[PDB]
Amino acid sequence: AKMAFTLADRVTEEMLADKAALVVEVVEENYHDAPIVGIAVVNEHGRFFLRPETALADPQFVAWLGDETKKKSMFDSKRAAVALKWKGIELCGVSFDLLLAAYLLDPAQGVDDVAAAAKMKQYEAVRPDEAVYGKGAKRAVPDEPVLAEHLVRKAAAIWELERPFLDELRRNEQDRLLVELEQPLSSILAEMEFAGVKVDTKRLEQMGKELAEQLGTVEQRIYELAGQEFNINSPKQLGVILFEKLQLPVLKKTKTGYSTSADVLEKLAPYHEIVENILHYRQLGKLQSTYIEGLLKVVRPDTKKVHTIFNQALTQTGRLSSTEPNLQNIPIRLEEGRKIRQAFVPSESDWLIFAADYSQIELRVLAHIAEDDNLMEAFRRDLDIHTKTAMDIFQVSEDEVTPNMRRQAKAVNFGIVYGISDYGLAQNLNISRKEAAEFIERYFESFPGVKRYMENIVQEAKQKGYVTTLLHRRRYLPDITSRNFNVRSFAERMAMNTPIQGSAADIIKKAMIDLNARLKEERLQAHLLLQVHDELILEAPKEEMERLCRLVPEVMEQAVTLRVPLKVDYHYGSTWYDAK
DNA sequence: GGGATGGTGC
DNA sequence: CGCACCATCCCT
Ligand SMILES: *[C]1[C]([O])[C]([O])[C]([O])C2=[C]C3=[C][C]=C4[C]=[C][C]=C5[C]=[C]C(=[C@@]12*)C3=C54
Ligand SMILES: OC[C@H]1O[C@@](CO)(O[C@H]2O[C@H](CO)[C@@H](O)[C@H](O)[C@H]2O)[C@@H](O)[C@@H]1O
Ligand SMILES: [Mg+2]
């Protein structure tokens, strides 16, 4: 049953054909500056395995890799592209990426290796990566014979699966989504990850010093208020101190014991002075462990940069996620944590950070898809939509809108975006399940088109079995017909929010591609560094700021054309903190 | 190594 | 909020 192939010692002409399935294996999860353990090539002439030392030193092979006219089909081409960039080798001509294709066909499948993607088409002549390499502590690269066969089989699978996958994508009207959006985006993300973001490590260390001091003071204060020392970070030990020794009211219980959630503690603060201290303690400890030590651990000491990895094939909405580090959750609400952003700086002297963000892109997309006259008009007038919603649901004038009213209106507006139930709108507004579900009725009276959309989208999800986004991304909702209320309800909420969140994701991605193209045509040195939430972060020579102020927002606002305008705000400064 | 639990962003 | 990513605790 073994698969035939040539374990070559040298690169030959028939290995450099016009089209081929290519495997450039990087086993380490984080591929930055990581080893390439082997190379496999499958084309019309046969199947070949090449040792990286010889192949990556062969002028002809390297030329083939960088020749855009030589088309390659791969799985997770970004991984290979970045690993090669670190070795000073350019990878061009990737016309098909099986990972992205599988992701678009069904993001819920969680395809993470060739075998999983192949299984979608009843192809099983390839082993899953985990079976070949191991899980974790027992992970390792096998001997050449086993390694070569595995890489060749993955290449063979890619070679066979391209047509089948492309055919279904076309049937799904997702062929352009793959070829014109996701694949081109993959190359841009590779560039961003490789470029990295410079970190002021000295600044971070200075902050850590101050935190350790304030932390030591608070922990001691907590021990005196408790009349004893214990592991504050231990929810079990803490629970005993709070709900047994101090007899605080047990308002919330968890699976294994007492609930010590911050919102729970927030309500217990009045009962004992220790609560506020424990809250402050967790605050400080969070910044110290997660955002100071955790960040410092992933900064490359030789370049002083962090090189995140964007997971382009993970979320069910089409949004990107990032790890090592995750720059999509860096503190900003509280000033204490926000200062962390001062440690992210330009990579060159006399350069600055420029950030542009879409203003309410989710609600603008909702206005567009629902075609709600009131909501579209609201955005056409560029009104503060939370104040506007408050005026409508509460039947008051803009001058009668109180700060708390706007806050409540804001929670209602986002309810559908987040995908919360009438229950959720209560757990947030800290009101009753009935009142929470009572404002929604008032909201639908003001925005009948949104109500219509919510009813229509759920019915469409039931009829077709899935919902779609502006650029044809898809999400299957099999639970939509569940006879279990909680399960069905969640599927309905996903039916309602996916076209919103998903379309916003589509637009952001398109904007990145359009921007990258414009920056090149304009010959600007400016370049993308990060994509977080609904914003794009770049760095550029201080001399380019004025041009970027006009160029970036325009490109982002024109990415797509909706029934309402797209609005982009922007800021720039010496650090990320200064650009917001 | 991996369960449960808590916190950050939107 | 759902959901992504981390962190620490603590027992296999
Ligand atoms: C919720 C959920 O989809 C998460 O997986 C996702 O990272 C995230 C990102 C995100 C970005 C921008 C934005 C703007 C308005 C409202 C929301 C609500 C939820 C999420 C989540 C947003 C939002
Ligand atoms: O870019 C990530 C990409 O690779 C996958 C494997 O197919 O994820 C692997 O690499 C990530 C980056 O280090 C890890 O977070 C993840 O645990 C590892 O399996 C895909 O999920 C993704 O599309
Ligand atoms: Mg925004």
XYZ file of C-alpha atoms (C1' of nucleotides) and ligand atoms in Angstrom:
649
model
C 0.000 0.000 0.000
C 3.085 2.215 0.311
C 3.227 5.279 -1.931
C 5.960 5.436 -4.569
C 8.258 8.445 -4.778
C 11.842 9.495 -5.388
C 13.946 10.355 -2.350
C 16.270 12.617 -4.336
C 19.776 13.705 -3.361
C 19.743 16.474 -5.973
C 17.137 18.769 -7.549
C 16.240 17.900 -11.148
C 14.443 19.672 -13.997
C 11.260 17.582 -13.789
C 10.926 18.736 -10.176
C 10.419 22.307 -11.358
C 7.266 21.932 -13.457
C 4.726 24.690 -14.214
C 2.280 23.264 -11.659
C 2.740 21.205 -8.519
C 1.575 20.372 -5.019
C 4.316 21.604 -2.685
C 4.955 20.746 0.957
C 7.556 22.781 2.899
C 7.226 21.194 6.331
C 7.560 23.254 9.507
C 6.690 21.106 12.528
C 7.117 23.680 15.313
C 3.723 25.284 16.049
C 5.235 28.773 16.005
C 6.929 28.886 12.593
C 8.921 32.085 13.091
C 12.610 31.374 12.423
C 11.734 27.674 12.756
C 13.310 24.696 10.941
C 11.987 23.312 7.665
C 12.280 19.544 8.212
C 11.627 18.368 4.673
C 10.197 19.213 1.271
C 7.831 17.234 -0.959
C 6.845 17.905 -4.546
C 4.153 16.171 -6.587
C 3.585 17.097 -10.222
C 2.891 15.579 -13.646
C 6.344 13.939 -13.661
C 5.983 12.138 -10.344
C 6.468 12.467 -6.592
C 9.672 13.726 -4.952
C 11.123 14.251 -1.468
C 13.991 16.697 -0.970
C 16.131 17.391 2.085
C 15.933 21.123 2.930
C 19.718 21.580 3.105
C 20.166 20.617 -0.547
C 16.935 22.040 -1.970
C 17.100 25.415 -0.229
C 20.691 25.870 -1.434
C 19.891 24.959 -5.031
C 19.735 28.135 -7.178
C 17.216 26.546 -9.536
C 14.882 25.374 -6.773
C 15.004 28.742 -5.009
C 14.300 30.413 -8.354
C 11.359 28.038 -8.901
C 9.967 28.885 -5.461
C 10.058 32.606 -6.212
C 8.758 32.354 -9.786
C 5.130 33.545 -9.751
C 4.475 31.784 -13.059
C 5.306 28.433 -11.464
C 2.041 27.585 -9.690
C 1.959 25.717 -6.395
C -0.887 24.087 -4.475
C -0.293 23.840 -0.734
C -1.808 23.550 2.745
C -1.189 26.603 5.007
C 1.058 28.428 2.558
C 1.527 31.272 5.070
C 3.410 28.912 7.420
C 5.831 27.960 4.634
C 6.092 31.523 3.318
C 7.075 32.985 6.693
C 9.511 30.171 7.515
C 11.155 30.828 4.153
C 11.187 34.625 4.669
C 13.260 34.060 7.808
C 15.733 32.208 5.576
C 15.773 34.983 2.995
C 13.763 33.017 0.428
C 10.645 34.315 -1.323
C 7.697 32.034 -2.052
C 5.483 33.065 -4.959
C 2.894 31.476 -7.209
C 0.686 29.825 -4.610
C -2.573 29.479 -6.540
C -4.358 27.093 -4.157
C -4.296 26.707 -0.360
C -6.212 23.647 0.876
C -6.435 24.980 4.431
C -8.186 28.177 3.337
C -10.373 26.235 0.875
C -11.486 23.811 3.585
C -12.032 26.729 5.993
C -14.341 28.504 3.552
C -16.306 25.325 2.774
C -17.055 24.739 6.449
C -15.326 26.710 9.221
C -16.974 24.474 11.828
C -15.020 21.401 10.697
C -11.943 22.820 12.393
C -9.623 21.549 9.664
C -6.075 21.803 11.040
C -4.150 19.358 8.846
C -4.237 17.826 5.380
C -5.822 14.584 6.591
C -8.789 16.430 8.102
C -9.368 18.365 4.877
C -9.016 15.207 2.800
C -11.562 13.385 4.953
C -14.164 15.931 3.772
C -13.891 14.326 0.324
C -13.597 10.681 1.408
C -9.819 10.665 0.828
C -7.948 8.817 3.569
C -4.578 7.820 2.060
C -2.775 10.272 4.348
C -2.171 10.237 8.110
C -3.073 13.106 10.461
C -0.026 15.140 11.520
C -0.539 14.287 15.195
C -0.280 10.554 14.492
C 3.040 11.068 12.718
C 4.646 13.676 14.985
C 3.030 13.000 18.343
C 1.011 15.176 20.716
C 3.300 17.411 22.766
C 5.866 16.247 25.306
C 6.118 13.160 23.101
C 6.300 15.260 19.926
C 9.213 14.887 17.513
C 10.270 14.468 13.886
C 10.438 10.779 12.842
C 13.273 9.192 10.866
C 13.602 10.143 7.196
C 11.719 7.117 5.773
C 8.579 7.859 7.788
C 8.953 11.629 7.361
C 9.381 11.463 3.581
C 6.380 9.192 3.066
C 4.162 11.447 5.170
C 5.180 14.612 3.305
C 4.745 12.884 -0.050
C 1.280 11.616 0.931
C 0.244 15.114 2.056
C 1.500 16.499 -1.262
C -0.315 13.737 -3.150
C -3.553 14.533 -1.290
C -3.259 18.236 -2.105
C -2.623 17.340 -5.769
C -5.787 15.217 -5.935
C -8.040 17.419 -3.794
C -7.550 20.750 -5.584
C -10.125 20.186 -8.329
C -12.799 18.715 -6.012
C -12.455 21.571 -3.525
C -12.414 24.272 -6.210
C -15.537 22.744 -7.767
C -17.544 22.902 -4.547
C -16.315 26.444 -3.846
C -17.523 27.501 -7.296
C -20.898 25.837 -6.673
C -21.027 27.773 -3.382
C -20.110 31.005 -5.207
C -16.964 31.140 -3.047
C -14.296 30.730 -5.728
C -13.504 34.462 -5.781
C -13.657 34.553 -1.975
C -10.725 32.095 -1.980
C -8.722 33.343 -4.976
C -9.352 37.083 -4.670
C -9.723 37.581 -0.918
C -8.316 34.892 1.425
C -5.285 33.777 -0.578
C -4.082 37.306 -1.401
C -4.708 38.214 2.243
C -2.576 35.266 3.364
C 0.466 36.829 1.670
C -0.197 40.190 3.321
C -0.497 38.553 6.747
C 2.795 36.697 6.151
C 4.439 40.073 5.522
C 2.908 41.601 8.648
C 3.955 38.719 10.911
C 7.503 38.703 9.536
C 7.846 42.479 9.865
C 6.759 42.258 13.488
C 6.191 45.090 15.951
C 9.021 46.689 17.928
C 8.706 46.591 21.713
C 10.253 48.971 24.249
C 11.339 46.202 26.612
C 12.969 48.643 29.034
C 9.647 50.444 29.403
C 7.824 47.161 30.048
C 10.379 46.171 32.681
C 10.047 49.565 34.377
C 6.279 49.024 34.555
C 6.724 45.513 35.908
C 8.933 46.926 38.653
C 6.220 49.337 39.759
C 3.533 46.644 39.570
C 5.508 44.224 41.735
C 5.734 46.974 44.350
C 2.069 47.987 44.331
C 1.179 44.292 44.227
C 3.282 43.495 47.281
C 1.569 46.276 49.205
C -1.950 45.136 48.297
C -1.374 41.428 48.975
C -0.123 42.317 52.446
C -3.154 44.541 53.007
C -5.355 41.612 51.976
C -3.668 39.317 54.497
C -4.305 41.735 57.362
C -7.955 42.208 56.390
C -8.290 38.422 56.267
C -6.386 37.905 59.501
C -4.176 35.349 57.770
C -2.129 34.587 54.668
C -3.411 32.430 51.819
C -3.108 32.059 48.050
C -5.260 34.923 46.783
C -4.835 33.468 43.290
C -6.442 30.275 44.572
C -10.218 30.552 44.008
C -10.601 27.665 46.455
C -8.571 29.242 49.254
C -10.124 32.626 48.507
C -13.622 31.171 48.597
C -13.045 29.848 52.108
C -11.820 33.220 53.369
C -14.685 35.140 51.774
C -17.718 32.893 52.164
C -16.809 30.990 55.324
C -14.456 33.017 57.522
C -15.896 36.422 56.569
C -19.395 35.053 56.020
C -19.987 37.066 52.856
C -23.290 36.381 51.031
C -23.064 33.536 48.518
C -24.906 35.109 45.600
C -23.212 33.042 42.898
C -22.045 29.431 42.953
C -19.730 27.634 40.537
C -19.423 23.975 39.541
C -16.656 23.061 41.991
C -17.447 25.659 44.655
C -17.905 29.365 45.376
C -17.983 31.916 42.560
C -15.412 34.706 42.894
C -16.102 36.434 39.587
C -15.221 40.142 39.497
C -18.870 41.072 38.968
C -19.760 38.904 41.961
C -17.115 40.589 44.105
C -18.284 43.975 42.844
C -21.574 43.354 44.669
C -19.820 42.121 47.816
C -17.598 45.196 48.157
C -20.019 46.984 50.542
C -19.860 44.073 52.999
C -16.113 44.010 53.581
C -13.056 46.135 52.784
C -11.108 43.066 51.651
C -13.185 42.776 48.468
C -11.999 46.027 46.870
C -8.431 44.985 47.688
C -8.843 41.556 46.080
C -10.281 43.278 43.011
C -7.355 45.705 42.828
C -4.995 42.760 43.381
C -6.341 40.745 40.447
C -6.195 43.878 38.315
C -2.492 44.355 39.012
C -1.685 40.650 38.817
C -3.399 40.415 35.438
C -1.231 43.159 33.943
C 1.928 41.759 35.548
C 1.565 38.088 34.606
C -0.271 38.428 31.295
C 0.726 41.764 29.800
C 4.199 42.382 31.242
C 5.840 38.999 31.846
C 3.750 37.290 29.173
C 4.673 39.899 26.577
C 8.352 39.957 27.508
C 8.459 36.171 27.060
C 7.571 36.351 23.368
C 9.696 39.346 22.368
C 12.663 38.245 20.232
C 15.750 39.433 22.172
C 17.871 39.916 19.048
C 15.454 42.272 17.284
C 13.265 43.486 20.136
C 10.124 42.633 18.158
C 7.089 40.420 18.694
C 6.044 38.371 15.674
C 2.426 37.357 16.140
C 0.810 34.592 14.136
C -2.573 35.373 12.618
C -4.882 32.366 12.484
C -6.771 32.922 9.239
C -8.720 29.651 9.401
C -10.220 29.499 12.871
C -13.251 31.695 13.593
C -16.791 30.875 12.522
C -17.345 34.519 11.613
C -14.374 35.073 9.315
C -12.529 37.402 11.694
C -8.798 36.868 12.222
C -7.333 35.858 15.592
C -3.710 36.114 16.728
C -1.372 34.387 19.167
C 2.127 34.649 20.651
C 1.304 37.268 21.425
C -2.405 37.943 21.115
C -2.441 41.670 20.342
C -6.200 41.741 20.019
C -6.805 42.043 23.763
C -4.157 44.529 24.955
C -5.675 46.711 27.760
C -7.321 50.026 26.864
C -10.395 50.595 29.063
C -8.466 51.317 32.263
C -5.583 53.794 32.092
C -3.370 51.569 34.264
C -3.432 48.844 31.633
C -3.685 51.205 28.667
C -0.160 52.469 29.360
C 1.011 49.011 28.285
C 0.482 50.259 24.724
C 3.272 52.797 25.167
C 5.683 49.857 24.858
C 4.703 49.227 21.233
C 6.801 51.551 19.102
C 7.879 52.188 15.487
C 10.613 49.850 14.233
C 12.650 52.727 12.766
C 13.817 56.090 14.078
C 11.692 59.035 12.921
C 8.818 56.659 12.119
C 5.373 56.780 13.710
C 2.390 54.509 14.415
C -0.806 55.205 12.434
C -4.123 53.533 13.342
C -7.404 53.718 11.431
C -10.642 52.161 12.680
C -14.094 51.665 11.220
C -16.731 53.537 13.191
C -19.722 51.294 14.002
C -19.130 49.073 10.984
C -21.345 46.317 12.484
C -24.413 48.542 12.887
C -23.821 50.138 9.469
C -23.708 46.655 7.930
C -26.919 45.849 9.813
C -28.558 48.984 8.383
C -27.495 47.862 4.925
C -28.652 44.239 5.091
C -31.921 44.943 6.914
C -32.616 48.052 4.839
C -34.202 49.605 7.908
C -35.195 53.152 6.914
C -34.684 54.639 10.372
C -31.259 53.071 10.900
C -29.992 53.909 7.400
C -31.189 57.519 7.792
C -29.434 57.641 11.171
C -26.101 56.746 9.585
C -26.735 58.962 6.575
C -26.919 61.844 9.048
C -23.843 60.417 10.822
C -25.723 60.552 14.137
C -24.350 59.141 17.384
C -26.291 55.896 17.054
C -26.458 55.115 20.776
C -27.954 58.523 21.590
C -30.304 58.107 18.635
C -31.442 54.674 19.829
C -31.983 56.110 23.313
C -34.160 58.932 21.968
C -36.234 56.381 20.051
C -36.741 53.578 22.561
C -37.234 56.004 25.458
C -39.205 58.543 23.400
C -37.163 61.605 24.396
C -35.234 64.452 22.751
C -31.442 64.408 22.418
C -31.252 66.849 25.321
C -33.259 64.492 27.543
C -30.868 61.580 26.967
C -29.036 60.943 30.238
C -25.626 59.213 30.483
C -27.242 56.053 31.847
C -29.906 56.118 29.127
C -27.223 56.190 26.430
C -25.435 53.350 28.222
C -28.605 51.244 28.205
C -29.292 52.090 24.545
C -25.738 51.080 23.687
C -26.247 47.667 25.314
C -29.464 47.191 23.336
C -27.812 48.155 20.031
C -25.048 45.628 20.540
C -27.345 42.884 21.797
C -28.067 41.623 18.293
C -24.459 42.158 17.224
C -23.071 40.095 20.126
C -25.836 37.548 19.626
C -27.357 37.648 23.119
C -30.825 36.490 24.160
C -33.389 38.493 26.123
C -31.651 36.903 29.117
C -28.281 38.323 28.126
C -29.623 41.844 27.659
C -30.603 41.465 31.319
C -27.329 40.075 32.661
C -25.808 43.212 31.110
C -28.360 45.918 31.896
C -28.571 44.282 35.329
C -32.352 44.463 34.985
C -35.131 41.869 34.786
C -35.562 39.249 32.067
C -38.927 40.843 31.293
C -37.714 44.442 31.154
C -34.705 43.397 29.077
C -37.072 41.711 26.636
C -39.335 44.747 26.991
C -36.903 47.271 25.525
C -36.404 45.035 22.493
C -40.074 45.476 21.626
C -39.571 49.232 21.848
C -36.448 48.852 19.715
C -38.286 46.889 17.022
C -41.028 49.524 16.927
C -38.329 52.080 16.142
C -36.427 49.749 13.806
C -39.042 47.518 12.089
C -36.597 46.624 9.327
C -34.187 45.075 11.836
C -37.040 43.018 13.304
C -37.960 41.887 9.789
C -34.334 40.920 9.109
C -34.070 38.889 12.308
C -37.231 36.972 11.415
C -36.184 36.484 7.786
C -32.597 35.422 8.461
C -33.646 32.722 10.938
C -36.127 31.333 8.397
C -33.463 31.392 5.681
C -31.047 29.517 7.958
C -33.707 26.868 8.536
C -34.548 26.584 4.830
C -31.027 26.579 3.376
C -29.201 25.163 6.392
C -26.726 28.058 6.501
C -26.363 31.853 6.457
C -24.002 33.944 4.323
C -22.056 37.201 4.454
C -21.580 40.032 1.949
C -18.665 38.320 0.203
C -20.289 34.870 0.380
C -18.628 33.429 3.489
C -20.849 30.679 4.885
C -21.794 29.255 8.282
C -23.879 26.088 8.603
C -26.375 26.025 11.481
C -27.552 22.415 11.947
C -28.772 23.249 15.474
C -31.335 25.634 14.018
C -33.893 22.789 14.016
C -33.028 21.422 17.461
C -35.984 20.627 19.691
C -33.952 21.838 22.674
C -34.805 25.498 23.326
C -31.367 26.631 24.512
C -29.555 24.915 21.640
C -31.970 26.134 18.948
C -32.047 29.674 20.343
C -28.274 29.952 20.177
C -28.293 28.798 16.548
C -30.916 31.441 15.780
C -28.751 34.102 17.436
C -25.812 32.923 15.321
C -27.994 33.126 12.214
C -28.684 36.747 13.101
C -25.156 37.846 13.990
C -23.011 35.982 11.460
C -24.086 38.057 8.432
C -23.302 41.163 10.500
C -19.985 40.142 12.097
C -19.035 38.107 9.039
C -19.643 40.916 6.582
C -17.616 43.314 8.752
C -14.812 40.741 8.635
C -15.095 40.525 4.830
C -14.835 44.308 4.469
C -11.804 44.604 6.760
C -9.996 41.909 4.763
C -10.811 43.573 1.458
C -9.650 46.926 2.833
C -6.291 45.346 3.743
C -5.804 44.026 0.225
C -6.840 47.331 -1.381
C -4.590 49.310 0.996
C -1.554 47.108 0.376
C -2.050 47.684 -3.361
C -2.428 51.462 -2.955
C 0.635 51.835 -0.732
C 2.694 50.071 -3.405
C 1.376 52.191 -6.289
C 2.071 55.303 -4.196
C 5.608 54.086 -3.441
C 5.065 54.645 0.290
C 7.318 52.962 2.850
C 4.361 52.718 5.224
C 3.203 49.168 5.905
C 0.619 47.209 7.844
C 1.665 45.858 11.218
C -1.539 44.603 12.793
C -5.237 44.091 12.296
C -7.296 44.098 15.475
C -11.041 44.310 15.923
C -12.216 46.755 13.245
C -8.930 48.577 12.829
C -5.694 48.527 10.884
C -2.414 49.525 12.509
C 0.528 50.661 10.377
C 3.924 52.295 10.931
C 5.580 54.733 8.527
C 8.116 57.570 8.171
C 6.899 60.692 9.954
C 7.052 62.346 6.514
C 4.184 60.131 5.295
C 1.610 60.897 8.010
C -0.195 63.635 6.091
C -0.589 61.464 3.007
C -1.729 58.499 5.112
C -4.367 60.680 6.797
C -6.071 61.028 3.421
C -5.146 57.706 1.839
C -5.947 55.135 4.519
C -9.466 56.298 5.443
C -10.394 56.661 1.764
C -9.257 53.129 0.903
C -11.107 51.701 3.910
C -14.298 53.696 3.282
C -14.358 52.594 -0.360
C -13.571 48.900 0.187
C -17.207 48.073 -0.584
C -20.279 50.162 -1.338
C -23.210 49.851 1.061
C -26.587 51.597 1.303
C -25.013 53.755 4.016
C -21.557 55.358 4.183
C -18.622 53.643 5.864
C -16.817 55.928 8.330
C -13.185 55.641 9.383
C -11.469 57.467 12.237
C -7.690 57.732 12.487
C -4.908 58.813 14.839
C -1.122 58.575 14.853
C 1.712 59.053 17.316
C 5.072 57.970 18.708
C 3.683 54.788 20.286
C 0.580 52.633 19.877
C -0.793 54.331 22.998
C -0.538 57.698 21.263
C -2.452 56.416 18.232
C -5.107 54.991 20.591
C -0.680 17.076 30.832
C -5.459 19.019 31.295
C -9.496 19.940 33.910
C -12.025 24.371 36.007
C -11.960 29.309 36.799
C -11.106 34.249 36.016
C -9.972 38.454 32.944
C -8.921 41.142 28.633
C -10.868 42.976 24.142
C -15.282 44.155 21.128
C -22.817 39.816 26.048
C -20.139 35.092 22.412
C -15.426 33.802 21.830
C -10.593 34.256 21.336
C -6.544 34.178 24.013
C -4.038 33.858 28.151
C -2.977 33.304 33.128
C -2.645 30.282 37.743
C -4.305 26.571 40.590
C -4.059 21.831 41.373
C -4.370 16.844 40.690
C -3.613 12.877 37.083
C -17.167 38.504 19.590
C -16.653 37.150 19.055
O -17.029 37.001 17.658
C -15.133 37.066 19.169
O -14.681 35.795 18.687
C -14.511 38.184 18.294
O -13.092 38.339 18.445
C -14.904 39.629 18.639
C -14.389 40.774 17.853
C -15.145 41.994 17.651
C -14.570 43.100 16.884
C -15.319 44.337 16.688
C -16.662 44.486 17.255
C -17.432 45.709 17.080
C -18.760 45.831 17.648
C -19.353 44.741 18.401
C -18.602 43.517 18.589
C -19.164 42.430 19.329
C -18.442 41.228 19.528
C -17.085 41.040 18.989
C -16.325 39.784 19.196
C -16.487 42.131 18.219
C -17.249 43.379 18.020
O -1.589 30.059 11.279
C -2.172 29.078 12.127
C -2.812 27.963 11.269
O -2.184 26.692 11.579
C -3.066 25.855 12.360
C -2.747 24.375 11.942
O -3.296 24.002 10.669
O -2.704 26.107 13.769
C -1.393 25.723 14.333
O -0.523 26.910 14.497
C -1.004 28.004 15.378
C 0.094 29.093 15.382
O 1.227 28.695 16.148
C -1.372 27.448 16.805
O -2.043 28.431 17.603
C -2.303 26.197 16.693
O -2.455 25.603 17.972
C -1.569 25.052 15.730
O -2.429 23.916 15.641
C -4.500 26.333 11.994
O -5.430 26.305 13.087
C -4.324 27.765 11.460
O -5.102 28.005 10.294
Mg -14.336 50.958 16.352
